[PDB]
Amino acid sequence: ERGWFDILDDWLKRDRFVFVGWSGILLFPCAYLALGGWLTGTTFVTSWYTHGLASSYLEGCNFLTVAVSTPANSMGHSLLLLWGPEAQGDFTRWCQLGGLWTFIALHGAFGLIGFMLRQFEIARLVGVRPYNAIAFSAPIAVFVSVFLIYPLGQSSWFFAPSFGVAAIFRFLLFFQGFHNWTLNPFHMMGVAGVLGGALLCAIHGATVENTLFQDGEGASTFRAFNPTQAEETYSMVTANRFWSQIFGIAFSNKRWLHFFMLFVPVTGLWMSAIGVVGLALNLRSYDFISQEIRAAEDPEFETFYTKNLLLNEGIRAWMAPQDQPHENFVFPEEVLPRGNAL
Amino acid sequence: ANLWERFCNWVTSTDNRLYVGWFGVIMIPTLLAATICFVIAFIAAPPVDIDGIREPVSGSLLYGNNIITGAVVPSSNAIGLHFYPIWEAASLDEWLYNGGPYQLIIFHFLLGASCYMGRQWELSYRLGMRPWICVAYSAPLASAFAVFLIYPIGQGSFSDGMPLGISGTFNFMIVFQAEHNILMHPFHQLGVAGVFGGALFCAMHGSLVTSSLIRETTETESANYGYKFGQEEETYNIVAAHGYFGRLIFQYASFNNSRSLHFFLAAWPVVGVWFAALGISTMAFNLNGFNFNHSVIDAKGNVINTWADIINRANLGMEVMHERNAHNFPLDLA
Amino acid sequence: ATNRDQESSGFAWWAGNARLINLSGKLLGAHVAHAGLIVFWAGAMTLFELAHFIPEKPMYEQGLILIPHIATLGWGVGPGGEVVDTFPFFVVGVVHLISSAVLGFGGVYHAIRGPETLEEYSSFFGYDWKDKNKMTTILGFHLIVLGIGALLLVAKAMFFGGLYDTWAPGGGDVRVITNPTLDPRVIFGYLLKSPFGGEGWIVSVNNLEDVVGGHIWIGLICIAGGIWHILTTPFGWARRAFIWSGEAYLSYSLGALSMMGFIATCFVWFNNTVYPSEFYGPTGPEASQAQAMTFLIRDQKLGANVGSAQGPTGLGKYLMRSPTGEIIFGGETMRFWDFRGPWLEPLRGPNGLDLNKIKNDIQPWQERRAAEYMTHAPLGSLNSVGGVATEINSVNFVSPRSWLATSHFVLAFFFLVGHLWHAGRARAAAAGFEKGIDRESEPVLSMPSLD
Amino acid sequence: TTGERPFSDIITSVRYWVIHSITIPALFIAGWLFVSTGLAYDVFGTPRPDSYYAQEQRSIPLVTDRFEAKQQVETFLEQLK
Amino acid sequence: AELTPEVLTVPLNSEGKTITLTEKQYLEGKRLFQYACASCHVGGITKTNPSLDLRTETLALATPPRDNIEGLVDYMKNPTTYDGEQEIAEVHPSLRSADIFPKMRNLTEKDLVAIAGHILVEPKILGDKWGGGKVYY
Amino acid sequence: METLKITVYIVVTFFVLLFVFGFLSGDPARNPKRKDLE
Ligand code: CLA
Ligand code: CLA
Numbered sequence A: 001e002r003g004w005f006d007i008l009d010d011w012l013k014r015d016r017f018v019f020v021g022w023s024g025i026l027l028f029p030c031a032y033l034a035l036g037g038w039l040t041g042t043t044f045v046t047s048w049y050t051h052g053l054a055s056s057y058l059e060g061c062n063f064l065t066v067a068v069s070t071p072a073n074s075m076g077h078s079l080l081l082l083w084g085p086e087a088q089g090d091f092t093r094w095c096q097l098g099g100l101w102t103f104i105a106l107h108g109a110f111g112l113i114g115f116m117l118r119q120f121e122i123a124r125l126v127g128v129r130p131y132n133a134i135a136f137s138a139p140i141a142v143f144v145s146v147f148l149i150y151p152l153g154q155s156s157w158f159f160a161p162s163f164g165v166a167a168i169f170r171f172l173l174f175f176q177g178f179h180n181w182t183l184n185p186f187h188m189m190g191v192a193g194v195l196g197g198a199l200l201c202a203i204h205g206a207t208v209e210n211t212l213f214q215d216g217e218g219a220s221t222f223r224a225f226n227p228t229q230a231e232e233t234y235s236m237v238t239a240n241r242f243w244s245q246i247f248g249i250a251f252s253n254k255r256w257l258h259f260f261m262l263f264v265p266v267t268g269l270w271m272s273a274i275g276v277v278g279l280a281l282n283l284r285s286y287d288f289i290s291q292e293i294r295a296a297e298d299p300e301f302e303t304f305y306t307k308n309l310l311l312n313e314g315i316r317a318w319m320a321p322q323d324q325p326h327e328n329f330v331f332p333e334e335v336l337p338r339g340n341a342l
Numbered sequence B: 001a002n003l004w005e006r007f008c009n010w011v012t013s014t015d016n017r018l019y020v021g022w023f024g025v026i027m028i029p030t031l032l033a034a035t036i037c038f039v040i041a042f043i044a045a046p047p048v049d050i051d052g053i054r055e056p057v058s059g060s061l062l063y064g065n066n067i068i069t070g071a072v073v074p075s076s077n078a079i080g081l082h083f084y085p086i087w088e089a090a091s092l093d094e095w096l097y098n099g100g101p102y103q104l105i106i107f108h109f110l111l112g113a114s115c116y117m118g119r120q121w122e123l124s125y126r127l128g129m130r131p132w133i134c135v136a137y138s139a140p141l142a143s144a145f146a147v148f149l150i151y152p153i154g155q156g157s158f159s160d161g162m163p164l165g166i167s168g169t170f171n172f173m174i175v176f177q178a179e180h181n182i183l184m185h186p187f188h189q190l191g192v193a194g195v196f197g198g199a200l201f202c203a204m205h206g207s208l209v210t211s212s213l214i215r216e217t218t219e220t221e222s223a224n225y226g227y228k229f230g231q232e233e234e235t236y237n238i239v240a241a242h243g244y245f246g247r248l249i250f251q252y253a254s255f256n257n258s259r260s261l262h263f264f265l266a267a268w269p270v271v272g273v274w275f276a277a278l279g280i281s282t283m284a285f286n287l288n289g290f291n292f293n294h295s296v297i298d299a300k301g302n303v304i305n306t307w308a309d310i311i312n313r314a315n316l317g318m319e320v321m322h323e324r325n326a327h328n329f330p331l332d333l334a
Numbered sequence C: 001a002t003n004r005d006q007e008s009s010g011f012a013w014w015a016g017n018a019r020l021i022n023l024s025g026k027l028l029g030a031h032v033a034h035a036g037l038i039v040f041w042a043g044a045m046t047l048f049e050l051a052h053f054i055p056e057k058p059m060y061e062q063g064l065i066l067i068p069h070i071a072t073l074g075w076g077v078g079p080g081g082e083v084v085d086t087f088p089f090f091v092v093g094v095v096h097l098i099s100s101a102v103l104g105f106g107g108v109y110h111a112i113r114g115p116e117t118l119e120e121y122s123s124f125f126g127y128d129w130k131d132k133n134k135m136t137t138i139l140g141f142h143l144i145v146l147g148i149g150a151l152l153l154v155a156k157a158m159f160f161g162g163l164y165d166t167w168a169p170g171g172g173d174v175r176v177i178t179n180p181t182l183d184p185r186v187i188f189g190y191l192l193k194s195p196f197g198g199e200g201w202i203v204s205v206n207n208l209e210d211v212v213g214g215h216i217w218i219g220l221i222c223i224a225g226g227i228w229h230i231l232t233t234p235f236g237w238a239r240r241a242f243i244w245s246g247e248a249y250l251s252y253s254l255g256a257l258s259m260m261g262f263i264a265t266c267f268v269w270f271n272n273t274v275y276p277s278e279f280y281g282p283t284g285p286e287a288s289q290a291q292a293m294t295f296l297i298r299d300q301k302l303g304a305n306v307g308s309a310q311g312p313t314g315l316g317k318y319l320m321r322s323p324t325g326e327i328i329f330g331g332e333t334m335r336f337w338d339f340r341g342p343w344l345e346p347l348r349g350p351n352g353l354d355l356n357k358i359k360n361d362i363q364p365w366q367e368r369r370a371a372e373y374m375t376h377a378p379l380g381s382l383n384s385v386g387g388v389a390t391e392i393n394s395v396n397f398v399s400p401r402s403w404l405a406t407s408h409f410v411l412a413f414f415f416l417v418g419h420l421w422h423a424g425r426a427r428a429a430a431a432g433f434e435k436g437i438d439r440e441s442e443p444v445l446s447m448p449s450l451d
Numbered sequence D: 001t002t003g004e005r006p007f008s009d010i011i012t013s014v015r016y017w018v019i020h021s022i023t024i025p026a027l028f029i030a031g032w033l034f035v036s037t038g039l040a041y042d043v044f045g046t047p048r049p050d051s052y053y054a055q056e057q058r059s060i061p062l063v064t065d066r067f068e069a070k071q072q073v074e075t076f077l078e079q080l081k
Numbered sequence E: 001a002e003l004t005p006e007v008l009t010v011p012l013n014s015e016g017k018t019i020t021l022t023e024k025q026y027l028e029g030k031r032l033f034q035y036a037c038a039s040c041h042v043g044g045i046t047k048t049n050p051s052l053d054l055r056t057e058t059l060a061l062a063t064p065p066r067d068n069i070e071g072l073v074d075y076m077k078n079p080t081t082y083d084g085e086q087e088i089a090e091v092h093p094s095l096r097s098a099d100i101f102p103k104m105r106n107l108t109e110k111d112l113v114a115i116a117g118h119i120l121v122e123p124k125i126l127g128d129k130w131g132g133g134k135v136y137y
Numbered sequence F: 001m002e003t004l005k006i007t008v009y010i011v012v013t014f015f016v017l018l019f020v021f022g023f024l025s026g027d028p029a030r031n032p033k034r035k036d037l038e
């Protein structure tokens, strides 16, 4: 068996500086177009006709404020293809209608698929187990739930996150004010997985570096390691005693330790994804009913929970007219919620 | 050996199930006091006039809270930074109304946790280890100091310290955003790179090591039984893990040195969290996030909004609503 | 290239300066050159500030931090802190800049041309870190130098023009101090004050007599201590308490400097005596109080009875009681009632703010000052947009009090981190395991199991 | 190594710089002119500072119909006189 | 939209005469207003007394009228309360009180005209934002 | 309250004194290798 397919497979799997692979055929153009689309938009392209915002270096934005913004709410969930019925093949109009947003979201999605396929392909060639790809399932679930499922549940792509620093900050604040997203136990598990993962990263790196064996004469200890060496470079036994005596418990099994390092942040991200799927439908953890019944009846009952809801109400009333221009909100001064003086 | 020597030997002993040590001598009573007060208060404390306007906020389970809404509530704005121990109050009922437990707990806790850091140094010394795990722990510790002590000092009141509760924590974050535009501050941004990055590298390292485990078991048993505590040989093949990751990106983007790799795993989240802490600690003195409100203007002079201005509208909502009965004059100056 | 690579020195390039630990000549060079960098910055930055200085605008509207330091000493200013002569600032700048050339010259010489070690060249200048007596002697020389410095401040205050006194009778002005506080009950009294609200430890120093007398005490103490350390060698208990090595001494100094940094942060944030609001802008507390004052004045002009006006919460809208009964300003500024400043004190009686004085005695200059301070509160963005976080672009302002406080918190924090790093390392190296665990002598392997 | 010439070799060679001392500034100048001639505005349809609003108008030209969005944009553009 | 001569044409006095400012005059006006006035009057409001703003309509109802160049220049020389009843130079920046408001010391007549021109032109650009406060940000 | 204050002061002083005298009791030598750090 040495036909054109096998010859191609040979070329695709050459050991070169940048490995290609069959997965490369999907991954390279899609990742390139997504990145190039973002750079192109943030440098040159407005959001005047979709959002009423300037969004590019060309208009005077900086790195923090540039974005490729979502299409107008009136576009619905249009794929907004360049040759589609909205832009009708007109590149300029396509940019003005927000076509770069779906360009980037879709090429980005297919590129992420390509990258996970790359993780599988390389693992298979090299003869290792595919846990890196498996762990990548968490980035996939986040991207798909946030940039795709979420706006698909809402009225249109307009409410997806826009690709920009400040734009993303706005997304966070929208979620606080409208969804009370910090109250959601799926977000809370996400937070624990992220902060716990960061904790594990720090503590494991630090522990290894402070239980090193002296394997050289240098006071800078990095050179006293050889990639081909059979011996552990640090003492698990000493590490175990230290942590047992400091914290009460300690790892004793290195395999379990590293598995756990995969488990914690990967599971956290998956949990946050589930919460966002509910938010696509406005299925929020917004309230505690018992709290509201009590507070409604008793004007002296106050908790941090009720205090945060008043903040959410402020966010909604003060941000909506400019953040949701298609609604044509006109909120007269007298109806705006405000405490004393401010 | 005299009694003082014997005592010293026991205190500093490497054979105790939990290490005590001189830092531990301060750590143990202080943490016990903060813990016991916290538990009792979280369950049973009456409402606390956090903002000094005779508007008591209920934080305890027995007074209408669940786990998510419950908190130990910061001491009164009328107190400010004044030291308010039990013995400064005419009565326990007074002490509780004014938020005395918050101060007792945060002070004992900050002292105890500082001592926890010292104790990590100390045990490392008793065992012949290198000393810097405690430096790693300085990052979360500095963060605690920032929200419980430095922010209050800068703003002039422990009423603005982070509440000891889940929803209270969220409250602290939202008001902080209204007042300092923390999302647009580069130190918080480095913080986020620090924790996202930490989680990423945690997963990455976990996955690479797990992927290169050397076969030592059968299909019907956990692969974890392939490692035995204290065995001299490494349990995974770093050469294979590096062959993999090096081909995933390119060769020179991957670590071949386990020591450099682990130092990176330490340094990335620790440094990023150091900046997170410094963010809060400097916004404590009102050096705030970037302000690009109305930065973009057209030829006539019309304001052209950017995403920064939408952020600004959100922040205005938070600002005008927070502590709705506490401001009498137009500017919220702390 | 003696000791200038990782193989000979044991230290990688990124820790290259550790290669200098036992090379006293070159290390002397590093130190002198660094001093040159500091003095350089002081001079250059002073000339930069002066070039960018408009005399009729307040200093704090102009991003100045050094000119305020000079003016506080009484140079260049008159009544109310008005600039009457910029020449002193010019002089301080130029002389520092010129001196930096000298220091840099010495530093470069010792660092790349002079003797690499000093010991064979001179018993006096040479040293062993582990030689306790030599260490205490050099420590002594330096203590005497510091003491002389403190006394130089005393001399400025008492014999060479005085200091700017925000508290001078009739309004702030430069004043000669003729009766420095010498009473140790007062001087060390500050040292025993709580650091919490209404006390504020040494940060509470509120008059120049105390500042000057305090510096007399510090001068004499430093000279006496220096003599002590030249004439003595460390006692047994000290010898047994400390690690005696270069990295250890460094770690000690790092802890000391961290402490001083935190202190300076608080000083510049709260104190308005040795950091006059005329030059540095109002404190946070000051500006908050000033807003309350401003609206009390406005509403009372309109006819309000500010003593009896009940606010929405039941507390006085303008005036209320502190927890010990003193009459103070209301609203959120209830937190800041410990504030004291020359524009406010004339309205203060025995029981706090006095309603009669408020009704009858508020002068136009007090209204002005309160308006100025209220509208120069130390709030502003990283790109120097003045005001709260939601304020629009228009005013280019971040208070010098904020710049100074934030910079010194960051520096103090990282210096604490450095103290931990170098203290832990000095311990490990003195004990002999800073490079890692001896595989054939792992201490934990000789210990009984925990269970 | 995978066979390609080491980068450190390439970027320290004379010929590399004979080539790139031309190609790099040329690209940089091309991008400059893309902005400076105003071509970027026309390619991407980004408003010039005088083209966000007509003289007296203060309402955003928001797209409100999906399938005639193009013509709406064109109408918005005409109304800038 | 552009900053046209029409936008830059504002009332000189209360008798129907206009003056057309130059673009450079407009820039000078914005600069001088930030320099001497914005600390209290950012955005056309008044931080130390929010009841009184710099809206053109508000200025027209002042005594004497302050919705023209002459009125504004005079205000900067000899400010009064809103009803014209008291002179307030002692607590409000003016040339008359340049001694106690030192930032007024370098302001020339040309400068005052520029500031007045700024105050009159801005609302023609910004509308309700000018004098509007945070509600219109 | 006065009794509570006195008591707490005594307790705190006791523990601080333990800390200080403890670290003064030949601490550099309390390590597994080179003890003579004097
Ligand atoms: C190779 C990887 C790759 C992948 C997976 C994608 C995927 C996509 N591109 Mg991208 N694109 C790529 C490379 C890729 N692109 C490259 C290299 C360029 C530069 C030329 C582009 C330039 C580009 C532009 C300008 C646009 C896209 C768009 C899209 C989206 C719609 C595509 C579509 O409907 O095709 C439909 C075609 C197929 C699925 C081909 C299937 C062929 C079948 C199986 C064989 C039968 C064909 C038949 C015999 C032909 C008969 C024709 C006859 C009847 C007339 C989709 C996400 C659009 C978009 O993003 O909108 C937001 C869009 O506007 N792409
Ligand atoms: C305050 C900053 C500072 C200072 C004063 C020093 C000083 C020193 N370093 Mg260190 N170092 C520093 C920061 C500093 N370092 C930093 C940031 C790094 C990381 C990049 C290092 C990494 C490092 C390593 C790896 C090593 C040193 C070494 C040294 C010593 C000898 C250097 C030598 O032989 O140069 C030779 C250099 C030259 C001959 C070139 C010219 C150098 C001169 C001094 C520049 C003068 C310029 C100035 C403008 C002239 C003004 C003149 C005018 C006054 C008349 C010297 C005492 C070495 C050492 O310890 O030796 C035992 C050593 O191996 N350093």
Ligand code: CLA
Pocket: B271, C045, C048, C049, C052, C062, C063, C064, C065, C382, C384, C400, C403, C404, C407, C410, C414
């Ligand atoms: C004590 C330190 C200090 C303080 C408080 C100030 C304060 C000020 N400076 Mg000065 N200055 C300093 C040092 C300082 N400077 C130094 C070292 C230089 C030489 C570079 C200058 C040269 C200088 C010039 C030329 C100017 C100023 C100006 C100013 C004013 C505006 C500052 C600004 O906009 O910053 C912007 C904010 C930043 C640049 C952010 C810096 C963030 C740093 C990089 C973070 C670093 C963290 C930490 C140090 C790193 C640790 C690493 C960790 C891993 C261990 C403000 C009053 C301006 C002025 O108004 O003059 C009238 C002005 O034009 N300064």
Ligand code: CLA
Pocket: C028, C032, C102, C103, C105, C106, C107, C109, C110, C114, C115, C118, C121, C122, C125
């Ligand atoms: C940290 C300060 C310091 C110290 C401890 C030393 C120490 C030394 N220097 Mg170096 N040097 C320094 C800074 C320093 N130097 C500076 C700033 C310069 C530039 C002028 C030099 C330029 C220099 C040269 C060119 C040479 C030395 C030499 C020496 C060695 C012999 C010194 C001697 O015998 O003088 C004897 C002492 C005197 C003659 C009396 C000095 C009178 C002083 C300067 C009056 C002012 C004192 C007052 C406290 C100054 C305060 C300054 C403050 C504001 C910063 C000795 C190791 C020699 C050497 O190493 O040969 C191998 C040598 O040739 N030095």
Ligand code: CLA
Pocket: C072, C073, C146, C147, C148, C149, C150, C151, C153, C163, C202, C205, C211, C215, C218, C222, C256, C259, C260, C261, C263, C264, C267, C268, C274
């Ligand atoms: C006890 C030390 C001490 C303290 C508390 C002060 C305080 C002050 N000085 Mg003074 N000064 C000192 C020593 C001190 N100084 C010395 C040694 C010199 C000579 C260099 C000076 C020369 C000087 C000048 C020229 C000026 C001042 C000024 C000031 C005032 C403003 C500056 C500031 O915020 O510093 C804050 C102070 C600190 C952060 C230091 C805190 C010291 C702590 C409490 C002790 C540290 C001890 C150490 C770690 C222990 C060693 C170990 C031992 C136990 C064995 C402030 C009241 C300014 C002024 O008054 O303007 C009118 C001014 O212009 N000082």
Ligand code: CLA
Pocket: C136, C139, C143, C191, C192, C221, C222, C224, C225, C226, C228, C229, C232, C233, C234, C235, C238, C241, F020
């Ligand atoms: C930079 C300044 C400096 C430094 C680094 C030193 C360093 C030293 N001194 Mg010296 N000394 C100095 C200045 C200095 N001194 C001055 C200015 C004087 C005159 C007052 C003296 C008078 C002096 C005497 C009489 C003695 C020393 C001794 C010593 C040695 C041991 C000290 C010790 O154990 O500290 C640590 C301090 C202790 C162990 C004591 C109690 C520790 C508690 C916890 C202190 C709590 C302070 C706390 C932080 C609160 C701070 C605020 C508070 C002040 C309100 C050590 C070499 C001793 C020695 O061996 O001489 C040969 C000694 O007997 N010194």
Ligand SMILES: CC1=C(/C=C/C(C)=C/C=C/C(C)=C/C=C/C=C(C)/C=C/C=C(C)/C=C/C2=C(C)CCCC2(C)C)C(C)(C)CCC1
Pocket: A032, A033, A035, A036, A037, A038, A039, A040
């Ligand atoms: C869209 C589209 C497309 C594509 C395009 C592309 C592909 C593009 C690319 C593009 C690109 C590819 C661009 C690039 C850019 C870049 C840049 C713009 C850069 C910059 C940089 C900088 C600025 C730097 C910075 C920094 C950092 C980052 C860090 C360090 C520091 C510093 C600061 C240096 C097509 C045609 C297909 C179709 C249609 C549509």
Ligand SMILES: CC1=C(/C=C/C(C)=C/C=C/C(C)=C/C=C/C=C(C)/C=C/C=C(C)/C=C/C2=C(C)CCCC2(C)C)C(C)(C)CCC1
Pocket: C029, C030, C033, C034, C036, C037, C040, C047, C094, C097, C098, C100, C101, C103, C104, C105, C107, C108, C111
């Ligand atoms: C060792 C070393 C180092 C360092 C070094 C250093 C750090 C040095 C320093 C140096 C210095 C520190 C220098 C300085 C100099 C200065 C000068 C040279 C000055 C001059 C001045 C002048 C000339 C002035 C003028 C004037 C006048 C008189 C008047 C007014 C105006 C003016 C300004 C024009 C390094 C890192 C590299 C590495 C290697 C080793």
Ligand SMILES: CC1=C(/C=C/C(C)=C/C=C/C(C)=C/C=C/C=C(C)/C=C/C=C(C)/C=C/C2=C(C)CCCC2(C)C)C(C)(C)CCC1
Pocket: C186, C187, C188, C190, C191, C202, C205, C210, C211, C212, C213, C214, C215, C217, C218, C241, F019, F020, F021, F023, F024
């Ligand atoms: C000038 C002035 C003044 C005065 C000041 C003074 C007079 C100061 C003093 C100061 C002082 C008099 C300080 C002291 C300090 C001390 C210290 C800081 C100590 C430390 C210690 C240590 C660090 C130790 C450690 C340890 C332990 C604990 C255990 C054993 C081991 C060891 C040794 C490691 C006044 C305020 C009036 C006003 C303003 C001006």
Ligand SMILES: CCCCCCCCCCCCO[C@@H]1O[C@H](CO)[C@@H](O[C@H]2O[C@H](CO)[C@@H](O)[C@H](O)[C@H]2O)[C@H](O)[C@H]1O
Pocket: B004, B005, B008, C236, C237, C238, C240, F020, F024, F025, F026, F027, F029
């Ligand atoms: C206010 C707090 C108190 C401040 C006091 C500081 C003033 C300076 C005097 C400090 C005196 C230190 O006195 C210190 O005490 C202990 C107890 O006897 C001594 O004795 C210690 O020696 C050995 C050292 O190998 C220890 O193992 C042993 O447990 C202990 O007996 C120290 O060798 C001595 O140095």
Ligand SMILES: [Cl-]
Pocket: A307, B171, B175, B321, B322, B323, B324
């Ligand atoms: Cl709130």
Ligand SMILES: [Cl-]
Pocket: B326, B327, B328, B329, C330, C331, C332, C333
């Ligand atoms: Cl208020």
Ligand SMILES: [Cl-]
Pocket: none
């Ligand atoms: Cl109105």
Ligand SMILES: [Fe+2]
Pocket: A204, A208, B205, B209
């Ligand atoms: Fe590991």
